[model samples]
Target: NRIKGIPKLDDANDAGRNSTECTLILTEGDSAKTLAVSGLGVVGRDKYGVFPLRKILNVREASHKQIMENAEINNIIKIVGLQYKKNYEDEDSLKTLRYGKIMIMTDQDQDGSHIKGLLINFIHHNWPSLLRHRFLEEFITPIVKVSKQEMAFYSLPEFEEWKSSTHKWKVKYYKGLGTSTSKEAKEYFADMKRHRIQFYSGPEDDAAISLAFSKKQIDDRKEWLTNFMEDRRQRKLLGLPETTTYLTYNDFINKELILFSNSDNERSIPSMVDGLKPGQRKVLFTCFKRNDKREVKVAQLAGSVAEMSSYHHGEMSLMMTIINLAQNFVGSNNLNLLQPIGQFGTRLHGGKDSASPRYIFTMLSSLARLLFPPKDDHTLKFLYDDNQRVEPEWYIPIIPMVLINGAEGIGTGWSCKIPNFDVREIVNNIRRLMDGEEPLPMLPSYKNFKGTIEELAPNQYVISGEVAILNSTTIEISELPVRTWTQTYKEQVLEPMLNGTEKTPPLITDYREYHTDTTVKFVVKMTEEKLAEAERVGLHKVFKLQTSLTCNSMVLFDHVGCLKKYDTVLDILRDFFELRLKYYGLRKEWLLGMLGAESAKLNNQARFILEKIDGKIIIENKPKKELIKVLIQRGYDSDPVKAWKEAQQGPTFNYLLDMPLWYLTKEKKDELCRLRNEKEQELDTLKRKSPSDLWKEDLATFIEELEAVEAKEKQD
Candidate 1:
């Protein structure tokens, strides 16, 4: 006796449906059962006709919609007409949808929706035999419609439904035509996110008219972002800063590194688990389950704790980690539902609140369990689930995705951080994911409610970074060029330095050592397309933040950085000077801003770099592997192969292998600065800007800009 409280653009609810969509069980009624059939439609078979019931169950009417002209109804009917015409002859399609397609549209609001009921009554009263006694039936569809790949159906209840699910409980909802699109309907249900489509289709859906107005009763659009940006929002958002970060930690940790300082990475993990990828968080959750008495401390972790790698807590840096770990758990407060707690609420008392202590704590606790056993050494962290098997890298990082939503990077004198995530709901969502509820579609678009959660397509969500690190932080975006247009390890090495010898790679190391007999040759090849993207971003141009992230990490502040002096040497000689050489660069004895220290600082930085290289190369080179044991250590494209080729030909190769132009720029700058005549030195020492010098010209501009600025500063 009711219709049209469908409060969404496309029908999505079932149990939450309203009475108008179906027949309410009354005391006494017609003898012939009014079977509510779903997926069945009119057909010539057996000389019988079937009616289509568009939706079932109505909680509210379309109060959001005012009285519409026939034109509006026709537009909606047109879509149904096309579907019927195209599918009419298909027996399977007809057989499956033989019932439940009928007029049920109504206003969600009170007065407006009442009018819609009058219309349905008018048709039913006039039709007579349509609701007749024998062989009569009222079709029912799901109030909560659902959809997935091939299947889309509403939950209709009648004796047939009860008969169909005999052993199982028969849950029924009443709804009609305007409730939602048929599961097989295409284009309209084009997305998977739950809230955004709700916004875009707000004015369209009759079902959501009431839902929209009842915002305070439930989480709405803004809450989705404040809570779950991923598994919901678009992979990308507008309002991106003028500059984007270049670091990608997930790629680095998995691909490189000989020893992981953290014990959680004790046993070698699968290559996929190497980076600080979302999977890392999921694995941490799994780790917590194994430990007996879950507690939080750094000492007790280490060994084969992950599905892929073994972990050891001892390897992790404890002191600084404790501070950082504590800070990460807390979050900033805002207009959203998350009420911050402990140090978090206070820490985020004002300003743009970001980061959540609860989430960090949850994740930290999860990681603790994954990295250690309960009764072990340093610290103990427990698992929330007692019965579950460890499913590492499946859920933990899934919640802290806010880290990937904005600008990110990492370096010394360089910092990289992720965009802060609102932790409240994401963690709850993860709970559902691990608990066996198939995830909500990658998105919450309309037309999905009539289907099952299993039918949704898969979409990978790449969370962008969260914070823009200004101080020293490690958001390591490897200096690898995944594409051609962008700079690579090589480009950072060879790009000209500002103001002569002080700029570029040659300033750091002499060219002779670069081109040794054992030099590793690299070739670069880039596609024309990426050059366009780079140019679009004006990437070739250098900036302060951009330069800071380069592998060509410099020693601008001189003694403030580690000195790279000292030549490659024998083990005995090398080992003896290692501590002393390292000490000189970091000593408190070295005064900052001291004119006397400048020369020593510069010399030390240069020498320190050379020594560092010798140490790193020995450690990285397989041929020198055992020897490197004695030596020391070692060290995205928006494109891929092109960047590699470009890298091969860029400065990294020349400096690492000793190319002539590489050192020429350095020696020339040093020689020029040494001479008495300043103007003459400028003319000859700097590379001239020309057609050939276009790539090199950036360095030239840097030098020229420096000249102008330096002169101005002196004059001022």
Candidate 2:
């Protein structure tokens, strides 16, 4: 006769006798029910009852058997004094209702809105006459809170209007009812009229509700959805609110999905200027900031980068980026930014055999600074995350690293694949650009690759591993195409052909691996007939020693930070040359300013010592402030050098005042004069050079250092 689990109000017996003033609050979950009950204090509880639902079943779509079996629907029906399939057309039937009104209380999000619709649909399906009495109402909650002035926005249109204002405001979006405190809930209940809305039904209300929920109206629903989305877009274009509800598929796609896709692209793709992804940039930034002359554990460096750069992803991925930056095997980086001091895997397994991050160590390579000069750091535009300075948006490397190292990434609806190019060829093209000559055509190249790349078609090339005919009965594979691992080739191609696992006659009688950690050498013996047949058919094709590389998808972020596709290496080179030349000019300007400041400081210091020796200025036993004042009055420039300002304090006469008494001697005076003269000479020399000259100097330095490194490696 009664609902066993229906949670009734404390004054249920008294309110049952007088149902006009009573309300039953239906909440989505137990936590929301608790919030509602607490919100309706002891006094408010007299007329308001709370019922927690484990989500109501869509009764409109449910079968009769399902309606009876659904626990939530049954409890709701019994609690509200509703019959299974009754028509409450008579006004007398309203007297039997336990509560005069049903108040739906849920979150302010899409799920909450959906739950409200389900409840309304349930009532409209079972009791059509109840709609005439305005039986359904909703307790509205704020979905967005403007924190600066503590304003609450219940609808997106209101928030959108506020957002259009020029003033800065901190806003918090509430996605669930549980996000609000009990105090806030109580405040919501305190202003009942402002926080409540009646679900008034009209002539078209039944059809609208049916279009939303009825399974038979799928095509109608699709049309409605398309129209709604079109309307939303129109509203957005008109500077109106794009949506009334907290969430919609269009909103999700625009806000969350687009945000995620952009972030993924930023993380995965390399920039044309710097040739580094977000993760790789963070790692390099952390390394440069640390300036660790000695090696640091890969794990330790990753943690530091994670903290310093605000890297929110997993530490393992950061560690992998670090390892990849230092991997210098064939088919890997042409020039490793970080020097790998431990087992940062070889081409045997394509860097898969690298040691654990904890066990391995790395430090910045000597060429890293040469490529990404610290002198240019001040000119680069750095990014900020959470009010803290992170890495630069992009680094202006000496070469177009996107081409030097190459890039391969798969992003949302787009992808990238740029084959590695020879550094010397890239530099030569840059030099040509500097000399006002059209750059030469460039081809894909890998460091230490003893193979050849032949153009098959436009933007397509075939890389062939070195396979030599040792004799009529034997062949030797001394190389592999870029990214093809030695162990994989042996196990997959050689072993399969030898064992007849490939469902073909044995191509080779036997095979042996004469490979080292950094070199691939495989010797295979075959019958004279098979060797002759292989030679006739092309040894590279028969032995699977050739791999095709396509340069069609050369997608990278341009200088404007937009993702763009380049048709050829020359196009990328041209863009990079313009940017690099501009940055070099900036670098030159920065250097000239620094050198001038240093020269001035040195000259001033030299004059101070000379004047101090000749008793032209008093320096003994004076307060620091007074001495600085006296130095300034004596026409002594106390302006700190720009380099000193970055590393130490601002404009001060400390250089003069802090000089020890032992440095006032004649020998010290000569040394100071010589140093001043040399600094001025250096300044004069730099001032006379153009940006192109600076580029040439840097190129010269890079070439010298590169040769030294190669010689050392050969010696080792």
Candidate 3:
């Protein structure tokens, strides 16, 4: 009977032919399958069947469950007529086999070698007796072909040896089987004896294979590779060439370590120009495009962002980013970009108790557009993914968002920790920069923080919680340090001190937590002796109410998108100032052009209506083309305004002719003239205003909106 399940095979029908004569050639991908089939032609198809194997799984590393479930592995098993974990050593067992030998026909590249090794490992792991019969073989192809004296080299070392001797020979390298022609493939198969090599495994070879793929032999494998690299003689013993270009451990560490390090930095750190990570930008970009005024489920929003923004990362991470952006709790984002419609956690648990993404809802905040104004969007440099435009590289906000909301992330070779600053202070500093005055030094500040921060050193500050002595032995703690969660403080600091640990005596006799969802309140009682002792050692220190904040490592991506470490917050502010001002100028120019276009359009419409009302323009029933011709003959401008040319309709008198009969009325004409005059006045005013004036206007709007949000919060 003929074989049924294998789709890519030319099977030997097993009519009366010897099973030992049949060989199954396993090739690389479909391209190699074409070459193999072409090489076999019609005559050899029955005896030598070709089956293209895709990138095979490494059976040594895969679980048994995975191996059994794999489609490629099952397909190979069915085509080869091999049962799982069955012996193939006996003559009877061999007779049942569909193919006598398994020939691996693959490219001569390292990846092809890996495929061959994986296939061999698969057979060795499942049917060890098959290896003893020398059932595995390799059909080698020429990796490099030389012209002018014609030589084919199978390995790079072989070509290098010839290269050292010959200078006039032109060499061509084949990285994959697709590069070779059908004729060249036929030539390889014609000389089967020279092209094929049967694999024979000795005891040492078995041990070596085990050492390479065994999970427990990692240290042994590392030692073996280390010894091989350290001693060239060891490489020579294994027939490996003495090439100094081989990657050493130090070289791998130096090269690959930097790559992943930079990748981590890019993912973790915020850009100075935009104050956003890549994920944050994608989330905001999706929100801006969606323009959803109503609340949307965070999970659904995350999915939309992942699809729309081409976000290649996991959905959970994107959901987390959305949640973080919307969280407006104390000690979190001072100026949240997304509105938190549901319980986006509280400062009580430091945002750890937030609802699941499925339950939580979010929408873009009103202040988001105010902060990242729409007019500046034209100035941003947008990036593309799969030919679709994604987010901009950075958005020029009205203020330095990184400073206002602050950022903390740990990356390889670098880390960032920026404490929050007041938005008012930041806006004032920007104002100073606009007025050609040096910005004043700003200290670390948190939104609605009732506690005090004292600068101890240049870049070090001690943030103390609000502690009030109600009586001699009673004290009230009204607040905590910026990032210290109330629950965490109760468990870590209060519990230990009140109960008295093994190392330290009880500092407080009793304590109670009367904290709400937002506020923190702790009334602790202590003996008079203990209170006097706490006063001597400072009550803030005794209760661990103060925390240290360091602004030393203010790492972020600079304006050119390079990783940098700023020494002071002012440095970041200054760089942002220059870039923001430049974008403001661009925004002004763009606005001026748009206003000019609008003014021109209005002026043209006014003139058209006026001329049509007069007896000079009589076009009661004229063809559009002839009307345009007559209008031009009458010295009327038939072409569209140059200022509005980019988006204008075809150059014609259509602006005049397209008007309805109602527009020819005296009232409509007067209205059109009034609109045109108003537009011209607006354009003149915009032209006279400086970019700094525009900045001030935006600043004023921002302050007004901030107050409105605050008032809304109070009302809520």
Candidate 4:
């Protein structure tokens, strides 16, 4: 069927027809001229053809008729020598395609990626077997060029990996193929392993374009990817790392497969066992393990936490986090859990001038000790963290530390927000919950709040502060709303006045800030007459220092390693109190158990010494045989395996057996007897009393002991 005015597939591979084996489509004429002048076409003259495209087509969502009608599309199709066995639109007809491989050629940039997409979409819809059967090669576009011996890198990672040792070469970033000289371009395209071959998973990739692009498969693909990948919680605690692959929809099942996992829940934050983030937990744990006995340099502490806790997160950031938690300077909102020494920071517009970590030292505050008391038994659990055998133990602090400091963390599929509350209010609420009383709705509290939070309505709260007249012309900022710092107010409020941005009655003003140990001072000045007129205009009311700061007071914590959200503060309080009571009972059991052992030791030692004194044996550096014979005859060392069983007990009695004669008096014996009796009586009383009864004796005093740091602060 020789049709007039139509080129047939027979002459598609002709040499004089001047078509190349691999047709390269360029975006610009200059790029085509540069390659042609370099005889790039002449070098691979028989196998390579060059064509310049005006611009990329919007072909991904275009119709097949529109694609066939496009001139560039038709030219590429004709050059490729693909023809249907019968007609152009017949999918059942086999194509006699000539080109062994087709690759999209464009500048190596984000723009290049877009052009690649357009070409792929066009080829996929018109002739899919070219890509789906692996007949296409994706260009290995270089991002870096080296001049000395001439080399190029396809990506930044590749350049970085090679640049360290190659000193003689000069490097430049590759903006496009046009930047490459004709000589360099010829060298680049000649390498056979210089590109990536397109990989299609049988019909999976082809099916994706069909499933997602076609109106035919729209119904089946409606909820494909959306419904399938609902949960991707990271299971780092379970020793599973997050997945990076994205899956495609399947034809047979008529839905997308969950090819890979993606979840914020698995990210390194709000840990599974305890609610502490990895960095925060490491800093606290580092302070605790060192016994918080003395101040530790912040720089030294950050390194230890990074190495010992295996924190792969940035060391500088970890050090900064430690400073933020420990800082007690004005405007710092976090609880002072770490005792900071030397230039922690000041809150002048978000502590912008916070000092470097090298100049800072930190120790766990007494408050930290009160919150996360050391546990003696192996009751705590640990995570098998990266680069270390085991790091970071899990524990619920005595108080809900999460609420006191609040938490904000982002993960793959989710994020969390827990607002801070006053420690006094949090504990008081816990006490109410323990007493089976319904707790009042908790209000948001902050570490450096200067204004009063008023409940305007059910879920609405307003923070308001007032400006006061310090003198005839001096206006004083007595308070500020929550989160509004002195520097912030100075910028927003005073800058407006100075710039005349606000046409106020008060004019001719001067302002400056003064700092007291307790509060921030922002003072403003105006003319005496203007100040009087400003006062009549309701100066403080019109310039009301108020802002809306409403928090949901949600609590985020880990319940058995997965993050769980509690809508209200009371929800977390109820659970923490349950754990608190259990901890108290465990502590009592440990205390009484140790006290009983001490009593047994005291009785045994007192009697052993008494026997030695009564016998009046040689007590000074006595020979082994004499001491053994005397002790054995008195039935002191009774058992055959007593030598092994009583090895540790030897120290308790051996020193007493050799005591000088003056020490073995009746007065000493009486003193020992009294001590033994006291311990025995105390043990008996403790055994009879339940832990609950001990706790009930004085709840307020017990709470004071836990809040020792806060109590001391109140006194100071």
* Candidate with maximal TM-score: 2
**Ten contiguous residues with the weakest lDDT in model 3:** 243-252
Write model 3 residue lDDT over 220-297, tens digit each, in one string.
754553343335445544676452212222332223222333566678989888789989999999999999979999
lDDT of prediction 3: 0.80
The TM-score obtained by model 2 is: 0.69
lDDT of 2 at 460: 94
Model 3 TM-score, 2 decimals = 0.64
Residue 614, candidate 3: alpha-carbon lDDT:
76
How big is the positional error of residue 426 in model 2, measured in Å on the Cα after superposition? 0.9
RMSD of candidate 3 to true structure, Å: 13.4
For every candidate, C-alpha RMSD to the true structure in Å: 32.1, 9.1, 13.4, 15.1
How well is each residue in 1-716 modelled by candidate 1, as lDDT tens digits?
11143221122122022212212111011111122112212221122222222221222233223323333333333322223223333334332222323333222223222333332322222332222211122222334332222222332243334445423333222232333334421222133111010001122222222322233524442332222223212232333321111212222121111112111121211111111322233334333444434333222322223332322133333222222332321121111111112232222121113233223222233233221222121111222221223333222111222221212223222222222322233333433433445332222111101111221222212221111212221122212121111222334433332122454222211111121111212222223453344335653232111211111211110111111211111111223223222322322122121222233323333433444444533323455335433323222011222333344341122122232323235564354334324433343333233322321232244335435643553484
List model 4 lDDT by residue over 1-716, tens digit each.
11133231112223232332333333334564455436454556455444555544556556668766787667666666665333433323323444445655566544554565566666665565555443555544466767727777765666767856645577776556666677766666676356433435655766665654455554555345334433223454455533112222233123212221222334344642245766677777767777758787888888888767767667667877788778664435446778767777666656555677778788877656656655422235567552244444466566666767766676534457655677778777766766778877877677656667777775357777767788987888777765566677677777777667545533547887785544767788888987888788877554557666444434243544444656565677676667666766886776576666667666665767676677655556888777777665655533322333344233224534554555468887788888989988988887887755554543454366646755566686
For model 2, state the Cα shift of residue 36 in Å: 13
Model 2 clash number: 0
Badly placed stretches (over 4 Å) of model 2 are 1-257, 502-506, 619-629, 638-673
Clashing pairs in 4: 21-47, 234-266, 263-413, 264-411, 264-412, 264-413, 272-561
What TM-score, computed on C-alpha atoms, does each candidate reach? Answer: 0.20, 0.69, 0.64, 0.55
